[PDB]
Amino acid sequence: REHWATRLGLILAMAGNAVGLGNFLRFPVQAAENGGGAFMIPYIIAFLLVGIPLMWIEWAMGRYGGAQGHGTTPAIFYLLWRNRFAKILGVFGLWIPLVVAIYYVYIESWTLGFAIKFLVGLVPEPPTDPDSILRPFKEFLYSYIGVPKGDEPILKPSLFAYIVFLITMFINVSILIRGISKGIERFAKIAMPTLFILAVFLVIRVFLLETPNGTAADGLNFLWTPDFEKLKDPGVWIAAVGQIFFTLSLGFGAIITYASYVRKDQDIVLSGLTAATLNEKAEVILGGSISIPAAVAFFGVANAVAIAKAGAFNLGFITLPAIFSQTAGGTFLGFLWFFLLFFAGLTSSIAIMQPMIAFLEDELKLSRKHAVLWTAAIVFFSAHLVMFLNKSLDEMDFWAGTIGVVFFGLTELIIFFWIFGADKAWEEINRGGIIKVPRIYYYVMRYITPAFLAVLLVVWAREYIPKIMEETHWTVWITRFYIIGLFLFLTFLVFLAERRRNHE
Amino acid sequence: REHWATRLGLILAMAGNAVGLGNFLRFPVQAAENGGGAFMIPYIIAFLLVGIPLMWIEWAMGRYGGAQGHGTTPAIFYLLWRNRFAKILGVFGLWIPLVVAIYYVYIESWTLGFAIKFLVGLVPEPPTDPDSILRPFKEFLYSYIGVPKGDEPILKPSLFAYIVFLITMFINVSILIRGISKGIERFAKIAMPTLFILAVFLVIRVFLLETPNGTAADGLNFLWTPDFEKLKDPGVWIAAVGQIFFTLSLGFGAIITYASYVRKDQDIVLSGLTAATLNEKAEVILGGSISIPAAVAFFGVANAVAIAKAGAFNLGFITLPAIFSQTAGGTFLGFLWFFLLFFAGLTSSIAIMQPMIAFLEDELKLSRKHAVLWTAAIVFFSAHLVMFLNKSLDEMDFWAGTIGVVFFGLTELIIFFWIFGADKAWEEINRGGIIKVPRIYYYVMRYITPAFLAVLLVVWAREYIPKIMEETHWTVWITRFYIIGLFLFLTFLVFLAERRRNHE
Ligand SMILES: CCCCCCCCO[C@@H]1O[C@H](CO)[C@@H](O)[C@H](O)[C@@H]1O
Ligand SMILES: CCCCCCCCO[C@@H]1O[C@H](CO)[C@@H](O)[C@H](O)[C@@H]1O
Ligand SMILES: CCCCCCCCO[C@@H]1O[C@H](CO)[C@@H](O)[C@H](O)[C@@H]1O
Ligand SMILES: CCCCCCCCO[C@@H]1O[C@H](CO)[C@@H](O)[C@H](O)[C@@H]1O
Ligand SMILES: CCCCCCCCO[C@@H]1O[C@H](CO)[C@@H](O)[C@H](O)[C@@H]1O
Ligand SMILES: CCCCCCCCO[C@@H]1O[C@H](CO)[C@@H](O)[C@H](O)[C@@H]1O
Ligand SMILES: CCCCCCCCO[C@@H]1O[C@H](CO)[C@@H](O)[C@H](O)[C@@H]1O
Ligand SMILES: CCCCCCCCO[C@@H]1O[C@H](CO)[C@@H](O)[C@H](O)[C@@H]1O
Ligand SMILES: CCCCCCCCO[C@@H]1O[C@H](CO)[C@@H](O)[C@H](O)[C@@H]1O
Numbered sequence A, B: 001r002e003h004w005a006t007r008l009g010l011i012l013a014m015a016g017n018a019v020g021l022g023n024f025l026r027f028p029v030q031a032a033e034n035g036g037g038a039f040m041i042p043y044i045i046a047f048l049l050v051g052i053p054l055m056w057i058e059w060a061m062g063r064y065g066g067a068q069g070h071g072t073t074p075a076i077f078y079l080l081w082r083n084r085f086a087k088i089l090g091v092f093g094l095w096i097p098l099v100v101a102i103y104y105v106y107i108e109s110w111t112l113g114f115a116i117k118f119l120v121g122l123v124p125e126p127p128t129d130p131d132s133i134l135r136p137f138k139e140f141l142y143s144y145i146g147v148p149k150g151d152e153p154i155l156k157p158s159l160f161a162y163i164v165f166l167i168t169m170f171i172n173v174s175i176l177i178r179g180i181s182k183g184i185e186r187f188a189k190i191a192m193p194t195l196f197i198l199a200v201f202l203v204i205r206v207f208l209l210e211t212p213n214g215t216a217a218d219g220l221n222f223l224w225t226p227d228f229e230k231l232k233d234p235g236v237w238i239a240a241v242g243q244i245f246f247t248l249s250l251g252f253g254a255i256i257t258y259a260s261y262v263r264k265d266q267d268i269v270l271s272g273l274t275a276a277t278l279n280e281k282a283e284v285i286l287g288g289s290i291s292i293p294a295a296v297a298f299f300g301v302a303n304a305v306a307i308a309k310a311g312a313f314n315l316g317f318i319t320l321p322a323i324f325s326q327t328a329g330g331t332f333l334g335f336l337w338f339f340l341l342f343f344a345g346l347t348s349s350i351a352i353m354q355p356m357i358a359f360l361e362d363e364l365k366l367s368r369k370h371a372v373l374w375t376a377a378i379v380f381f382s383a384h385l386v387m388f389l390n391k392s393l394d395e396m397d398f399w400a401g402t403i404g405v406v407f408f409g410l411t412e413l414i415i416f417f418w419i420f421g422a423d424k425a426w427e428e429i430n431r432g433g434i435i436k437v438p439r440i441y442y443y444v445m446r447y448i449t450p451a452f453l454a455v456l457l458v459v460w461a462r463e464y465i466p467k468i469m470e471e472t473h474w475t476v477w478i479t480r481f482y483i484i485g486l487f488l489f490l491t492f493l494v495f496l497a498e499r500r501r502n503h504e
């Protein structure tokens, strides 16, 4: 089996899996909407009670499977629970990252396309008032993605956008096809420092911004002043737990597969902790310091709230571009910003594609080249639904990317700490640990973490699924049909894997 | 390898593959529209110059592949032409019957649902004038299939319709899962005589029909009086060649796979000829005598033309039901009519599903039970697009079922008689023949048949594809996407097959 070459490379790859667009766009928007500085209360709590515990568990599951030649959950789940239903639940854990890859690489491609456009200065140039600066950037984005101009939910990406998607897939493939140590690890070692450098440069540049409407300080102010009254609200705790889940990429399958290239007794306790901490620093220190402070410096605390409510995507792809178009050196700054996002996405998309690659390798015994190419083929083909059908992305992100991962995380907790055995689980996590998990986490993992996740899944799912099932356009069924198809396809491959195994 | 048990069973199964709804609905409509009695000119010509020749070729290809353990075209094409592109063209020949199965079994289910409804008398009862009798039957059908009432191209089959689809799949599976001799062959031996009996009873009953508007004789009159002027028209020759292709099920893959269970030196010349002749008798004698004569007896030669133009589907599923609702014993007659159609479809759907079954068996070494069940799973799942998306059926029938098969037939001609070798082809067809193919067919096969097909593909494709590509609703892309996906899926399975082979 492939293995990480260095401790540092492992950790930077795992950190790269976690550090994505969310660090710089989602966290700051969720913190601003869910109590500002107060949000660090439920956020730090979620980190300690859900994020850390589940992260170690996923590392443990992957290292465990890896020792037996298995990096994906159909096989691993079955190893933890020798039952046909385990294999099936396991399929769900491979379907998630496949479906996510199918929209995420396209999202990633947009950051590359915008970096290129911003680098060469092929961007809009306004001219006044807020909407007069935003609209040209909204149009710029809408033209790139091909947002429907009419009543058909059909998208039409620009040719440039499509070609950039091809290039982005190519770049992912170039990395992946070199494998774990010479591809992913090697890339992480360049990518994480680059990312760090860009983010710091960005934070500095941002902190200098002054306009008649305000300064970067005003932005930090608005972002971080506590609103302790929002803690009363239950949706703030859901937001925090969800933000932790998303930021650490839990339940998505990448951690498990990456951890499957960690050696049998090689530490995961400290390595996992260190990768999580890197993500948290990039998230709260860097991400907390760029996008919102810029937007508030430029638009002023007067529009802070409306800006936060308009969301992470508008913030990263319309509002900041616009702000860059109005500040000194801003076009080049825009390139730096999108370059940052691109490496942030790229370090995660290689991670999210590796599980399908591992599966084909481990279970169907494809060569790495064939596994990477067929995985790229499936993702590339599939992504055409996402590129051309409006809201397809959203439906995949919901069922696989959201409901899916949280339910799957809960499943991970139960299979590992309850079915496999709480004491076996504990020993599996701690074996070879450079440091040991505090004994108190045994109870957190067995009782607290699953309870938490059970609430996130439940209290929340009641408040989401009915809307998605009832208030959506009929075309959602197209995406549902297709991804259910993908689930059936994976079930079939697992069936073939087990037939191939019985033969040999 | 499985083999047919009896000569008779082989022939009745192959005849059952050919004899379908077309015999009783399409042929009579095409003959009435393309010269009446005159139509037998280009029709008999097509039979001799395209239908017979290509049929023998497909039998020869399947028997040939069968001797080497291969019943489907990815493997067989490669055996005839050891080139990667051969395998790929071969994939197309397995994709066709998979896609066709995916809509055809649903069409079949409708005949079963209507037979049941008509048997128990749960049908509409009009009351006057033509539309006043038809409309309740149009509505009856529209309610069953769930034709869109609004502007969304969404279908909503009745629950009854859906359940009947489940039953129909079950019935197909029950037959298929018993395999070639104990399932398909055994069923053919009951089904073909039953079919013959129903058709004869129907012809007799129909010939007795008298109304103030006319008699069955008037119907035969209108149907068979020649219009030799239409032969001038090129589209009449296309219609005839196409009708022959469709009636004999050529290019669809079922003949090749069925023939793969014929023993290495067991005759195919006379057996193939005999199965074709059975289809022709059922088509021109029986099919020519029922549907149109009934419709004209009842509605009168005054509306003969308009009725023919309204098409085979309206004829079989609306107009005849209605006519049955106005004649003595007509409800029970309606049951007999739909029972006839059901067995006609059922004997063909088992044939069209066998290629995917053979592939999984021959190439992935699945057991017959697993191959049948997974094939049923894929067809069942896939059919939901056909059941719920308006015009999906039509798009599949076009690309796979129409363009597909004719192009594939041409491909068969070229690979066999040109690439494999015209003399090797000839010997392959004739080996073990009870009778020998007339020497003159050597030239027909090498020059005439491919020319014919090249024209059907070309002259016609110019006149069809632009309309389908330009004048269709955007939702066609959903079906295109999906069936291209199916093509990619099959390519992947072939890839796995060849990897499994290299390993063993
Ligand atoms: C290989 C998968 C086939 C599915 C059909 C998708 C073909 C993509 O088509 C492409 O779309 C681009 C972006 O809209 C256009 O700019 C280009 O003209 C190109 O035709
Ligand atoms: C490395 C230098 C090459 C970069 C050139 C590729 C970008 C060209 O992109 C162009 O941008 C224009 C302005 O937004 C658009 O109007 C055009 O549709 C086009 O996509
Ligand atoms: C390095 C990647 C950047 C190169 C991608 C450039 C492709 C965009 O080229 C585009 O072609 C379209 C069709 O002719 C034009 O309408 C656009 O204006 C644009 O020039
Ligand atoms: C993006 C890379 C080049 C940008 C370099 C310009 C950084 C200086 O930035 C400037 O700082 C001034 C105070 O010193 C402020 O009044 C202005 O907001 C201005 O942006
Ligand atoms: C969901 C799978 C993607 C399907 C949509 C991508 C291809 C759409 O392409 C479409 O083709 C039509 C017919 O040639 C053209 O008339 C349209 O302009 C459009 O380019
Ligand atoms: C079982 C899944 C629990 C998820 C809890 C946190 C999810 C909150 O994220 C939510 O996702 C929704 C659907 O994707 C979006 O429409 C909302 O805007 C929101 O961001
Ligand atoms: C490709 C075939 C699509 C058929 C879709 C038929 C079902 C239409 O139902 C649709 O379902 C949505 C999602 O639950 C709901 O928001 C609405 O009820 C909508 O009408
Ligand atoms: C197993 C494949 C899942 C795809 C969703 C299709 C579920 C079919 O749903 C069924 O449709 C019938 C016919 O319209 C309805 O009468 C029934 O209520 C039933 O819900
Ligand atoms: C073997 C006896 C059982 C046959 C009963 C099943 C048929 C019931 O079918 C019924 O037909 C009605 C009249 O068309 C419809 O209005 C109902 O929706 C229903 O589908």
Ligand SMILES: CCCCCCCCO[C@@H]1O[C@H](CO)[C@@H](O)[C@H](O)[C@@H]1O
Pocket: B159, B160, B163
């Ligand atoms: C042997 C196969 C025939 C049995 C199928 C009968 C299923 C149709 O049953 C249907 O249920 C619907 C939902 O409650 C009703 O609206 C219809 O009127 C009908 O009764």
Ligand SMILES: CCCCCCCCO[C@@H]1O[C@H](CO)[C@@H](O)[C@H](O)[C@@H]1O
Pocket: B205, B208, B209, B210, B211, B327, B328, B329, B330, B332, B333
């Ligand atoms: C469908 C099975 C039962 C049908 C039996 C009735 C057959 C007799 O049919 C009758 O023949 C008469 C002349 O003899 C005609 O005038 C009428 O059209 C009538 O249909």
Ligand SMILES: CCCCCCCCO[C@@H]1O[C@H](CO)[C@@H](O)[C@H](O)[C@@H]1O
Pocket: A469, A470, A477, A478, A481, B384, B385, B388, B389
């Ligand atoms: C192309 C794959 C088939 C998808 C369509 C079959 C399922 C459509 O079912 C739909 O579900 C909606 C949400 O629950 C309901 O509101 C609608 O009434 C409808 O039944």
Ligand SMILES: CCCCCCCCO[C@@H]1O[C@H](CO)[C@@H](O)[C@H](O)[C@@H]1O
Pocket: B238, B239, B242, B243, B397, B398, B402, B403, B404, B406, B407, B456, B457, B460, B461
């Ligand atoms: C390469 C394929 C050649 C086909 C020649 C005969 C086909 C004539 O059949 C045609 O099929 C069309 C599309 O399915 C239908 O829309 C027309 O009504 C017509 O029946």
Ligand SMILES: CCCCCCCCO[C@@H]1O[C@H](CO)[C@@H](O)[C@H](O)[C@@H]1O
Pocket: A154, A155, A385, A388, A389, A478, B468, B469, B470, B471, B472, B473, B474, B476, B477, B478, B481
């Ligand atoms: C599921 C995603 C569907 C995206 C479809 C986008 C292409 C829309 O183009 C469509 O193509 C049809 C067939 O060629 C043509 O009849 C029309 O040009 C139609 O507009």
Ligand SMILES: N[C@@H](Cc1c[nH]c2ccccc12)C(=O)O
Pocket: A017, A018, A019, A020, A021, A022, A023, A100, A104, A246, A247, A248, A249, A250, A252, A348, A349, A352
């Ligand atoms: N961790 C990423 C988000 C993420 C979760 N799961 C993923 C899977 C693939 C790519 C990204 C992700 C971020 O904070 O931005």
Ligand SMILES: N[C@@H](Cc1c[nH]c2ccccc12)C(=O)O
Pocket: A130, A299, A303, A306, A307, A310, A314, A315, A318, A319
């Ligand atoms: N219109 C912005 C949000 C917004 C509202 N008011 C503002 C004032 C300033 C800047 C942005 C805003 C968007 O949807 O993306």
Ligand SMILES: N[C@@H](Cc1c[nH]c2ccccc12)C(=O)O
Pocket: A242, A243, A245, A246, A397, A398, A401, A402, A405
């Ligand atoms: N659906 C979320 C993003 C997301 C994906 N997976 C998640 C898991 C947990 C929380 C959020 C997410 C959004 O659109 O904002």
Ligand SMILES: N[C@@H](Cc1c[nH]c2ccccc12)C(=O)O
Pocket: A263, A264, A265, A266, A267, A268, A431, A432, A433, A434
């Ligand atoms: N568990 C110890 C020692 C160890 C065991 N196997 C390893 C493989 C690689 C590196 C270290 C180790 C550690 O991680 O440090």
Ligand SMILES: N[C@@H](Cc1c[nH]c2ccccc12)C(=O)O
Pocket: B017, B018, B019, B020, B021, B022, B023, B100, B104, B246, B247, B248, B249, B250, B252, B348, B349, B352
């Ligand atoms: N031979 C059938 C039509 C047909 C052609 N190919 C098929 C494939 C499956 C089922 C039926 C068919 C008929 O005349 O009615």
Ligand SMILES: N[C@@H](Cc1c[nH]c2ccccc12)C(=O)O
Pocket: B130, B299, B303, B306, B307, B310, B314, B315, B318, B319
């Ligand atoms: N309206 C019938 C065809 C038709 C036209 N005129 C007629 C007169 C009598 C019977 C049928 C017809 C259909 O579309 O199905």
Ligand SMILES: N[C@@H](Cc1c[nH]c2ccccc12)C(=O)O
Pocket: B242, B243, B245, B246, B397, B398, B401, B402, B405
């Ligand atoms: N598409 C034809 C039926 C058909 C399917 N395959 C064919 C091959 C040849 C001729 C006709 C067909 C129709 O709707 O009428």
Ligand SMILES: N[C@@H](Cc1c[nH]c2ccccc12)C(=O)O
Pocket: B263, B264, B265, B266, B267, B268, B431, B432, B433, B434
């Ligand atoms: N070719 C001869 C004899 C023959 C060879 N192999 C066979 C297998 C089965 C039946 C007959 C045969 C025939 O078909 O009659």
Ligand SMILES: CCCCCCCCCCCCCC
Pocket: A021, A022, A025, A026, A100, A104, A107, A312, A313, A316, A397, A401
């Ligand atoms: C697995 C990734 C899901 C995407 C969630 C959003 C992340 C924050 C940046 C906004 C851009 C995303 C486009 C919908």
Ligand SMILES: CCCCCCCCCCCCCC
Pocket: B021, B022, B025, B026, B100, B104, B107, B312, B313, B316, B397, B401
């Ligand atoms: C392979 C079968 C294709 C269907 C062609 C039509 C056959 C004649 C009867 C009409 C009913 C079919 C519903 C579209």
Ligand code: NA
Pocket: A018, A019, A020, A022, A023, A246, A247, A248, A249, A279, A283
């Ligand atoms: Na993160």
